[PDB]
Enzyme design. Structure first.
Site, mmCIF file in Angstrom:
data_model
loop_
_atom_site.group_PDB
_atom_site.id
_atom_site.type_symbol
_atom_site.label_atom_id
_atom_site.label_comp_id
_atom_site.label_asym_id
_atom_site.label_seq_id
_atom_site.Cartn_x
_atom_site.Cartn_y
_atom_site.Cartn_z
ATOM 1 C CG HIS C 88 -1.848 -1.221 1.250
ATOM 2 N ND1 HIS C 88 -2.981 -1.316 0.469
ATOM 3 C CD2 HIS C 88 -1.782 -2.389 1.921
ATOM 4 C CE1 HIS C 88 -3.581 -2.459 0.682
ATOM 5 N NE2 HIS C 88 -2.871 -3.129 1.597
ATOM 6 C CG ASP C 91 -2.070 10.684 -4.980
ATOM 7 O OD1 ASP C 91 -2.067 11.938 -4.759
ATOM 8 O OD2 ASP C 91 -2.358 10.214 -6.162
ATOM 9 C CG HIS C 93 -5.981 14.387 -4.917
ATOM 10 N ND1 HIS C 93 -7.230 14.362 -5.522
ATOM 11 C CD2 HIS C 93 -5.320 13.251 -5.306
ATOM 12 C CE1 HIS C 93 -7.319 13.261 -6.251
ATOM 13 N NE2 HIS C 93 -6.186 12.537 -6.110
ATOM 14 C CG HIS C 128 -6.441 8.019 -4.067
ATOM 15 N ND1 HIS C 128 -5.592 7.274 -4.895
ATOM 16 C CD2 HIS C 128 -6.591 9.215 -4.669
ATOM 17 C CE1 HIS C 128 -5.293 8.009 -5.968
ATOM 18 N NE2 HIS C 128 -5.861 9.203 -5.833
ATOM 19 C CB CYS C 129 -4.219 3.136 -1.463
ATOM 20 S SG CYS C 129 -2.881 1.944 -1.656
ATOM 21 C CG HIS C 139 -4.916 -1.016 -3.586
ATOM 22 N ND1 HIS C 139 -4.115 -1.238 -2.461
ATOM 23 C CD2 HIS C 139 -4.656 -2.022 -4.448
ATOM 24 C CE1 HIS C 139 -3.378 -2.321 -2.677
ATOM 25 N NE2 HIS C 139 -3.735 -2.871 -3.864
ATOM 26 C CG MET C 144 -7.235 1.057 0.590
ATOM 27 S SD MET C 144 -5.598 0.309 0.607
ATOM 28 C CE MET C 144 -4.780 1.300 1.848
ATOM 29 C CG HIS C 249 -30.970 17.390 -3.491
ATOM 30 N ND1 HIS C 249 -31.288 18.644 -3.923
ATOM 31 C CD2 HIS C 249 -32.092 16.905 -2.906
ATOM 32 C CE1 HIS C 249 -32.513 18.955 -3.533
ATOM 33 N NE2 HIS C 249 -33.048 17.890 -3.005
ATOM 34 C CD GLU C 273 -32.378 22.473 -8.425
ATOM 35 O OE1 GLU C 273 -33.473 21.823 -8.218
ATOM 36 O OE2 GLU C 273 -32.193 23.216 -9.458
ATOM 37 C CB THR C 274 -28.557 19.232 -7.141
ATOM 38 O OG1 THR C 274 -29.841 18.839 -6.622
ATOM 39 C CG2 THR C 274 -27.699 18.034 -7.440
ATOM 40 C CG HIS C 300 -31.360 14.635 -7.013
ATOM 41 N ND1 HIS C 300 -32.207 14.242 -8.046
ATOM 42 C CD2 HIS C 300 -32.166 15.118 -6.046
ATOM 43 C CE1 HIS C 300 -33.443 14.546 -7.714
ATOM 44 N NE2 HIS C 300 -33.447 15.058 -6.499
HETATM 45 O O1 LIG Z 1 -0.272 -3.268 -4.069
HETATM 46 N N1 LIG Z 1 -1.200 -3.811 -4.740
HETATM 47 O O2 LIG Z 1 -1.893 -4.901 -4.756
HETATM 48 CU CU LIG Z 2 -3.734 0.028 -0.941
HETATM 49 CU CU LIG Z 3 -5.831 10.852 -7.119
HETATM 50 CU CU LIG Z 4 -35.146 15.856 -5.571
#
Ligand SMILES: O=N[O-]
Ligand SMILES: [Cu+2]
Ligand SMILES: [Cu+2]
Ligand SMILES: [Cu+2]
Ligand SMILES: OC[C@H]1O[C@@](CO)(O[C@H]2O[C@H](CO)[C@@H](O)[C@H](O)[C@H]2O)[C@@H](O)[C@@H]1O
Ligand SMILES: OC[C@H]1O[C@@](CO)(O[C@H]2O[C@H](CO)[C@@H](O)[C@H](O)[C@H]2O)[C@@H](O)[C@@H]1O
Ligand SMILES: OC[C@H]1O[C@@](CO)(O[C@H]2O[C@H](CO)[C@@H](O)[C@H](O)[C@H]2O)[C@@H](O)[C@@H]1O
Ligand SMILES: OC[C@H]1O[C@@](CO)(O[C@H]2O[C@H](CO)[C@@H](O)[C@H](O)[C@H]2O)[C@@H](O)[C@@H]1O
Ligand SMILES: OC[C@H]1O[C@@](CO)(O[C@H]2O[C@H](CO)[C@@H](O)[C@H](O)[C@H]2O)[C@@H](O)[C@@H]1O
Ligand SMILES: OC[C@H]1O[C@@](CO)(O[C@H]2O[C@H](CO)[C@@H](O)[C@H](O)[C@H]2O)[C@@H](O)[C@@H]1O
Ligand SMILES: O=N[O-]
Ligand SMILES: O=N[O-]
Ligand SMILES: O=N[O-]
Ligand SMILES: O=N[O-]
Ligand SMILES: O=N[O-]
Ligand SMILES: O=N[O-]
Ligand SMILES: O=N[O-]
Ligand SMILES: O=N[O-]
Ligand SMILES: [Cu+2]
Ligand SMILES: [Cu+2]
Ligand SMILES: [Cu+2]
Lengths: 341, 341, 341
Positions: C88, C91, C93, C128-129, C139, C144, C249, C273-274, C300
């Site tokens: 694993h 990352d 962002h 995320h992984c 993943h 993840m 929503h 609204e959304t 929605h």
């Molecule tokens: O690291 N991946 O299965």
């Molecule tokens: Cu992972």
């Molecule tokens: Cu990403």
């Molecule tokens: Cu609605």
């Protein structure tokens, strides 16, 4: 009679047209009275005559556009005639509380209900049926959705202190449909919405519509039902999608001013090619026509537009502007002395 | 010769590179002359060597980026050589009237046509083939789409009175492809676009691409064809998608200034992680590289990016900034005295 | 010890709750220390008890929300216990360089790593992984992913010089899952993530999830686990989706202030609204509750919300405002003298 304002009855009209209203008003707040009648019926939804078990507000897909001003109260009589088979209700995205009114409007066939909501938020908004649980998506993708527009009392503006006024308004409701097929791939027909439900739910689960239509059927706004305009007219196009994203585009035109999230407290974007209506919302685009002729209004997934039904036409009268665009040389044989590698 | 402006011939280059142009200019309006030659050909679109019957402008997917300034006139010679089998045309989303030019440019094999449009709207815009009816989505998802950039005469700005200038520009065209499979799941091959059509249309109807590629094939902008930059360079990335939504992301970077709807009359958003290109549009992102190394540029549906082909690489030369990011402790055995519940 | 700032250990809490933090701070920059422990485990993801082979940060889908201020340094210990079967990494962002930290954090079972990144960009961001190649989407859609919020040091503002303060904050992580089915349509079970992989990859390739869930399972935030609020409270709802678009929503409410691209350097939109969370991003919405009762928070696409698991509930205590909304007439028989055509 706690709320002591003048009352005004509005007569709704079938989309894509819009009932008579004022853009800017100096009237005070009113109670604006609307009536919506649920109608379950078989409807034709494509050019090969495919039918399906629709559920509608006022007999149309989409339901009619309701237009009010900020600070008005909207008093809606929802009617479910005893010829219908299911319970229905209504949720206004423009409204505050009780799941948009759905928690206060559930009616069996043979019943009606009266809901009042204050129009505190400006913009275009979806309304739709939402009975509960899996019935919610089923009633919405069966056709039970429309829109309401809450105008500022001073009308539209460009978000930089200039008034915008439309010469014409059209409401384009976009509907994703999920029609079951038999083992050979032919569309199945049913005698009631209830009979269609189990097979329809299986198609809905795979999140791929069989049809994507404007105003309830493929070709509804083409041919003799093309939308009319004139060179120089500012046209407001309201676009709603209650369940699935859309990417509107006026082929040969632009969005001069676009509220893609549909809310007039936010300044519009300018000069868009294609805009984005998120599923569960309405947006609005203003365009001033500069050239005559035929315009296609599409969702710019062109597979959906050309092959699943999501194309409308504008027919625009006026004089061609050769400065904006011209055919310099008509189609002709490639010259012998040409090299084209 | 009604229009008496200087003429300038432009030589187009293959994406992801962009022909020579000025950002800011004090030249007046010109007639900018471009030539596009339709080429139908079999092309390789994935790393296992899958082929498919492509239709292209100038032999590339995407078609080349055309760059002009606001107020220029764009005079396009479209050529359909007699080795091609179908009629073609061109629709500019940047243009006003006649379905973007499609209604004035329909040419049979052996013909050419000359269209002139005035560049009145700033931004990046899609162009694509649109012959009529079901042929529209088929020609577009067969590869017949590109983009045009209309710069303000003063170049880009941040929408708050500051000029923005790029050191480098790349055009990333994203293509959704619909390749038929046989009963075992293997991709089918055909000897002509016409032979592929019926099976391809069946895949298109289910709205799920088999491939999503940048610059015409999986891996096109990886390995030796990685995009080059240097620490400190402001790089403009133009991204187009003529048919389907995309969500661009620069892994390890950001969008410093992003026009996701792609129109320079609107101020850019700042510091985005991921942005959104609506199907039928082009957008643009400016980033100033701060760290050297490999960057992946993806659509952030990671299934599409990793498994259907939609990953590009930037290789960025310079010195690592340990203040922005550092490995404090390299991978090591979990300490015996650790509790990790 | 090149970086000489105060260090502060943060204890993470399980979503949808958020660890203790300050909105506005006059403390200087700190090194904020976080620990994330990878846990592979079978988890229940729907109300019929369907299981699947999940991979998580800290034993939850989503991973916990990390909250820091602009200019802080974030020092993350990632732990991969030897009971796990795969490598694993992580990352961010929010981070600059080395694929968001993924290129510096790859750890085998039995290993840990320490990454430090400077929080130079404000907003909510996905983490995320991303091990490499096809492992990246696998993943992420196995669970993840999480989010980090980087607040401005002065807290939130409306982009027009007014401070915004929330009374409560919830983190809604949305997960698209791809669970294999047998020939009869029943969900398949596996004894390890590795055994599930080949069948799962085939479902992922068709880009249609089997489940779309908040906080790791259908119904997770309904019933007794409804989210609490009070009339008058400003509630910040952080929404992330690491792989696929979402359209949040609040049924019966609005987004008063919405950062749909999730970045606080950009002014929020008002009265939505959304809204739209692009796959690979986080966004945030502020709403001040005006009415008591039950609110559904949905994506929605109502098929996803009602039939694939993507509904949460708010239970809001307070007094009903009949001025905003009232039932004028309860459900009653349609009057005999009525005409409803
Ligand atoms: O690291 N991946 O299965
Ligand atoms: Cu992972
Ligand atoms: Cu990403
Ligand atoms: Cu609605
Ligand atoms: O789409 C599957 C398969 O079914 C057929 C009939 O066997 O056509 C049906 O589906 C078409 C596309 O939706 C419709 O045009 C038509 O109304 C319907 O019968 C085949 O033509 C097609 O390959
Ligand atoms: O900003 C809205 C505006 O777009 C206008 C400019 O006034 O026109 C656009 O296209 C026209 C084509 O001739 C040009 O006037 C203009 O340069 C361009 O942005 C109007 O139609 C409208 O007010
Ligand atoms: O995808 C269905 C099924 O087909 C096989 C071949 O029988 O592989 C094909 O599809 C793969 C995914 O698109 C491609 O990697 C390959 O080029 C193609 O042959 C099976 O491997 C797969 O389960
Ligand atoms: O607003 C655009 C701007 O982002 C900049 C700030 O000048 O940098 C961002 O990341 C940098 C990382 O060191 C910081 O200077 C800044 O605090 C952050 O917003 C530039 O690269 C660019 O002009
Ligand atoms: O969805 C296909 C088909 O499978 C069945 C069982 O044969 O139900 C499965 O799929 C359902 C929808 O995902 C789930 O509700 C259920 O947990 C699962 O067994 C059929 O009911 C259905 O038509
Ligand atoms: O702009 C944010 C703002 O929305 C508010 C107005 O202050 O309320 C909206 O709904 C309220 C319903 O009574 C009205 O005050 C207002 O007219 C409408 O825009 C607040 O809840 C919030 O500050
Ligand atoms: O009150 N005048 O419209
Ligand atoms: O039936 N719809 O207009
Ligand atoms: O009210 N639902 O069928
Ligand atoms: O006219 N000078 O560039
Ligand atoms: O063939 N495309 O670059
Ligand atoms: O021109 N269409 O095949
Ligand atoms: O330094 N005071 O919070
Ligand atoms: O397991 N998720 O909250
Ligand atoms: Cu209903
Ligand atoms: Cu063509
Ligand atoms: Cu187009």
């Amino acid at each position: 009679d706690d709320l002591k304002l003048p009352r005004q009855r509005v007569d709704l009209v079938a989309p894509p047209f819009v009932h008579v209203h004022e853009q800017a008003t100096k009237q005070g707040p009113k109670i604006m009275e609307f009536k919506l009648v649920v109608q379950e019926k078989k409807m034709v939804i494509d050019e090969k005559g495919t039918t399906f078990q629709a559920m509608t507000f006022n007999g149309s897909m989409p339901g009619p556009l309701m237009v009010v001003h900020e600070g008005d109260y909207v008093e809606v009589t929802l009617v479910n005639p005893a010829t219908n088979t299911m319970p229905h209700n209504i949720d206004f995205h423009s409204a505050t509380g009780a799941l948009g009114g759905g928690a206060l409007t559930l009616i069996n066939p043979g019943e009606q209900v009266v809901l009042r909501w204050k129009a505190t938020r400006t913009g275009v908004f979806v309304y739709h049926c939402a009975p509960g649980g899996p019935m919610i998506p089923w009633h919405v993708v069966s056709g039970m959705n429309g829109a309401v527009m809450v105008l500022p009392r001073d009308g539209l503006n460009d978000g930089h202190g200039h008034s915008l006024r439309y010469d014409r308004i059209y409401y384009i409701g976009e509907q994703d449909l999920y029609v079951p097929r038999d083992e050979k791939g032919n569309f199945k027909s049913y005698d009631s919405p209830g009979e269609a439900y189990s097979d329809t739910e299986e198609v809905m689960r795979k999140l791929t519509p069989t049809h994507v239509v404007f105003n309830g059927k493929a070709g509804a706004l083409t041919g003799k039902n093309a939308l009319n305009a004139n060179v120089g007219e500012n046209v407001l196009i309201v676009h709603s999608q209650a369940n699935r994203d859309s990417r509107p585009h006026l082929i040969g035109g632009h969005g001069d001013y676009v509220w893609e999230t549909g809310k007039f407290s936010n300044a519009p974007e300018t000069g868009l090619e294609t805009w984005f209506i998120r599923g569960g919302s309405a947006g609005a685009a203003l365009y001033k026509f500069l050239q005559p002729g035929i315009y296609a209004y599409v969702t710019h997934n062109l597979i959906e537009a050309a092959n699943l039904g999501a194309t409308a036409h504008f027919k625009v009268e006026g004089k061609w502007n050769d400065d904006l665009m011209t055919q310099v040389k008509a189609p002709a044989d490639i010259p012998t002395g040409s090299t084209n590698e």
